[PDB]
């Protein structure tokens, strides 16, 4: 599992594993995922043909 965004640059060796949805836009997301409501955890789906 990876991400594309987090709210701040981390200090060295911190283990913030929180999956709180980022409100990138002005939308009050509050758990509703979508555009400008980006869920953190994503996957890359590694294939042998990559």
């Amino acid at each position: 599992l990876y991400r594309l965004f987090r709210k701040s640059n981390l200090k060295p060796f911190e283990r913030d594993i929180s999956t709180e949805i980022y409100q990138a836009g002005n939308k009050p997301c509050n758990g509703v995922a979508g555009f400008n409501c980006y869920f953190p955890l994503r996957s890359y789906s590694f294939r042998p043909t990559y």
Binding site: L4, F5, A24, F35, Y38
Partner: peptide, 12 residues
């Protein structure tokens, strides 16, 4: 406008 997918760079 609704969809804001971005590839290569971050959408923000």
């Amino acid at each position: 406008f609704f969809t804001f997918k971005c590839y290569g760079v971050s959408p923000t």
